[PDB]
Design an enzyme around this catalytic site. Structure first.
Site, PDB file in Angstrom:
ATOM      1  N   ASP A  36       0.808  -1.217   0.000  1.00 57.20           N
ATOM      2  CA  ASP A  36       0.000   0.000   0.000  1.00 57.20           C
ATOM      3  C   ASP A  36       0.843   1.271   0.000  1.00 57.20           C
ATOM      4  OD1 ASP A  36      -2.105   1.775   0.169  1.00 57.20           O
ATOM      5  OD2 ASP A  36      -2.484   1.388   2.309  1.00 57.20           O
ATOM      6  N   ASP A 232      -1.327   5.682  -5.437  1.00 55.66           N
ATOM      7  CA  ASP A 232      -1.770   4.783  -4.360  1.00 55.66           C
ATOM      8  C   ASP A 232      -2.082   3.355  -4.831  1.00 55.66           C
ATOM      9  OD1 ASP A 232      -2.838   3.613  -2.096  1.00 55.66           O
ATOM     10  OD2 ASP A 232      -4.687   4.819  -2.078  1.00 55.66           O
TER      11      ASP A 232
HETATM   12  C1  LIG Z   1      -6.041   7.819   6.655  1.00 60.22           C
HETATM   13  N1  LIG Z   1      -4.822   7.319   7.295  1.00 60.22           N
HETATM   14  C2  LIG Z   1      -4.628   5.945   7.114  1.00 60.22           C
HETATM   15  N2  LIG Z   1      -5.180   5.274   6.100  1.00 60.22           N
HETATM   16  C3  LIG Z   1      -4.954   3.954   6.008  1.00 60.22           C
HETATM   17  N3  LIG Z   1      -5.548   3.262   4.931  1.00 60.22           N
HETATM   18  C4  LIG Z   1      -6.610   3.899   4.170  1.00 60.22           C
HETATM   19  C5  LIG Z   1      -7.158   2.721   3.403  1.00 60.22           C
HETATM   20  C6  LIG Z   1      -7.686   3.220   2.089  1.00 60.22           C
HETATM   21  O1  LIG Z   1      -8.817   3.680   2.007  1.00 60.22           O
HETATM   22  N4  LIG Z   1      -6.809   3.198   1.031  1.00 60.22           N
HETATM   23  C7  LIG Z   1      -7.324   3.629  -0.257  1.00 60.22           C
HETATM   24  C8  LIG Z   1      -5.481   2.861   1.125  1.00 60.22           C
HETATM   25  N5  LIG Z   1      -4.671   3.130   0.155  1.00 60.22           N
HETATM   26  N6  LIG Z   1      -5.071   2.236   2.265  1.00 60.22           N
HETATM   27  C9  LIG Z   1      -5.999   1.730   3.268  1.00 60.22           C
HETATM   28  C10 LIG Z   1      -6.479   0.354   2.992  1.00 60.22           C
HETATM   29  C11 LIG Z   1      -7.222  -0.533   3.757  1.00 60.22           C
HETATM   30  C12 LIG Z   1      -7.537  -1.740   3.075  1.00 60.22           C
HETATM   31  C13 LIG Z   1      -7.046  -1.756   1.785  1.00 60.22           C
HETATM   32  C14 LIG Z   1      -7.201  -2.756   0.802  1.00 60.22           C
HETATM   33  N7  LIG Z   1      -7.355  -3.504  -0.069  1.00 60.22           N
HETATM   34  S1  LIG Z   1      -6.166  -0.328   1.442  1.00 60.22           S
HETATM   35  C15 LIG Z   1      -5.342   1.869   4.628  1.00 60.22           C
HETATM   36  N8  LIG Z   1      -4.177   3.251   6.846  1.00 60.22           N
HETATM   37  C16 LIG Z   1      -3.601   3.941   7.838  1.00 60.22           C
HETATM   38  C17 LIG Z   1      -2.724   3.154   8.774  1.00 60.22           C
HETATM   39  C18 LIG Z   1      -3.823   5.286   8.015  1.00 60.22           C
HETATM   40  F1  LIG Z   1      -3.235   5.981   8.999  1.00 60.22           F
END
Ligand SMILES: CNc1nc(N2C[C@H]3C(=O)N(C)C(=N)N[C@@]3(c3ccc(C#N)s3)C2)nc(C)c1F
EC number: 3.4.23.46
Length: 387
Positions: A36, A232
């Site tokens: 990610d 991303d």
């Molecule tokens: C907002 N701050 C933080 N945001 C996140 N994420 C936002 C999620 C998301 O919505 N997108 C898009 C992403 N790129 N990553 C995440 C995923 C979860 C499941 C996924 C799958 N398949 S991807 C994790 N993690 C932490 C630890 C933060 F601090």
């Protein structure tokens, strides 16, 4: 150069994520981890969950260290909660090094783990600014660079199959490569073009022009980066700010107007199907995003095809797809749609992101994805959004 040990180390697909094998603890516990570039924590399932067939067992690791601190991560589409600690971590098809890294042991979650995704944790590759609970929790890649001689760069080649993969096929197929500490020349064709990383938090970039089949969307370039534009790997779609999405979808509909599609298709909800082999790629336009270059007043463009922004889905013997461009209220997101067309170099050492045509992008005999330049573009700093 050539990083044969890391080529073809990813599995997965755009809808469920791309993952790499990692090991945690002593003796090593193998887990599959989502790559990610949109977050900065290394977090793994550490308690039973209906969608996990394995998880990190801290009590079985002699090198586990408890940080005695919780971490709560609510995000837009879901949430996870866990307990912070450190342990020894390795990437079997990676650099031949073992590092002591922070690990968030996930004990509770909601809509985080995906049924049948084959991954048990997440590897946040972005910068410490967006790490949870705060920027003092060193991200994995920062630890890897600090503790070893691995260069401060990684590159990703995410490979879309161009057709749906069933449960067994997706487990057996190569989903791409994550080259840690280098650039592998076998993964791309043509030249690499670099855009500056605007600021080190997300991998933030600046888009300076957008075309649909060569036709300028003609919006104030600040709209394309409102409130940011990021790269991303954890997002499936190409996501565009509301106003940009409305203008782009009008232009894509106009270019493809020889066939009418239902409103549900353009909303990314409903699939569209064609008789096997008859998908009319040629009626759909190419999309070009121009990015700020490294040289003053210079830009370059990346061009994707409908084979990137129409995501293959199973329905029959028809060839079916979902439209993988969608609206955002949090800026442009260049997700797996964009990334499947290109080999992407996250050159943290030189604060820049490189793009080249991927050797695994899906295309037809008449059109290919492209990375071209240079173009003269003025006042590109004005394209960046502030406040
Ligand atoms: C907002 N701050 C933080 N945001 C996140 N994420 C936002 C999620 C998301 O919505 N997108 C898009 C992403 N790129 N990553 C995440 C995923 C979860 C499941 C996924 C799958 N398949 S991807 C994790 N993690 C932490 C630890 C933060 F601090």
């Amino acid at each position: 150069g050539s990083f044969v040990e890391m080529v073809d180390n990813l599995r997965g697909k755009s809808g469920q994520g791309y993952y790499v094998e990692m090991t945690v603890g002593s003796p090593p516990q193998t887990l599959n981890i989502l790559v990610d570039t949109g977050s900065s924590n290394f977090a793994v399932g550490a308690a039973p969950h209906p969608f996990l067939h394995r998880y990190y067992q801290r009590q079985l690791s002699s090198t586990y260290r408890d940080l005695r601190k919780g971490v709560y991560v609510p995000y837009t589409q879901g949430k996870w909660e866990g307990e912070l600690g450190t342990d020894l971590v390795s990437i079997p098809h990676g650099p031949n090094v073992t590092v002591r890294a922070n690990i968030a042991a996930i004990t509770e979650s909601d809509k985080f783990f995906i049924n049948g995704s084959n991954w048990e944790g997440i590897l946040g590759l972005a910068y410490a600014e967006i790490a949870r609970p705060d920027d003092s929790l060193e991200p994995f890649f920062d630890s890897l660079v600090k503790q070893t001689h691995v260069p401060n760069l990684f590159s990703l080649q995410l490979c879309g199959a161009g057709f749906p993969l069933n449960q067994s096929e997706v487990l057996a197929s190569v989903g791409g490569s994550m080259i840690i500490g280098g650039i592998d020349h076998s993964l791309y064709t043509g030249s690499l073009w670099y855009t500056p990383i605007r600021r080190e938090w997300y991998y933030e970039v600046i888009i300076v022009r957008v075309e649909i089949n060569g036709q300028d969307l003609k919006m104030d370039c600040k709209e394309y980066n409102y409130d940011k534009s990021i790269v991303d790997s954890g997002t499936t779609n190409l996501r565009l700010p509301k106003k940009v999405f409305e203008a782009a979808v009008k232009s894509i509909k106009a270019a493809s107007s020889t066939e009418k599609f239902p409103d549900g298709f353009w909303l990314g909800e409903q699939l569209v199907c064609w008789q096997a082999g008859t998908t009319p790629w040629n009626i759909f336009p190419v999309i070009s995003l121009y990015l700020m270059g490294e040289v003053t007043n210079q830009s370059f463009r990346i061009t994707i095809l409908p084979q990137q922004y129409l995501r293959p889905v199973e329905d029959s013997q028809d060839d079916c797809y979902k439209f993988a461009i969608s609206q955002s209220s949090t800026g442009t997101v260049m997700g797996a749609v964009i990334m499947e067309g290109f080999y992407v170099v996250f050159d943290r050492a030189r604060k820049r992101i490189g793009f080249a045509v991927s050797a695994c992008h899906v295309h037809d005999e008449f059109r290919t994805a492209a990375v071209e330049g240079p173009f003269v573009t003025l006042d590109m700093e004005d394209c960046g959004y502030n406040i």
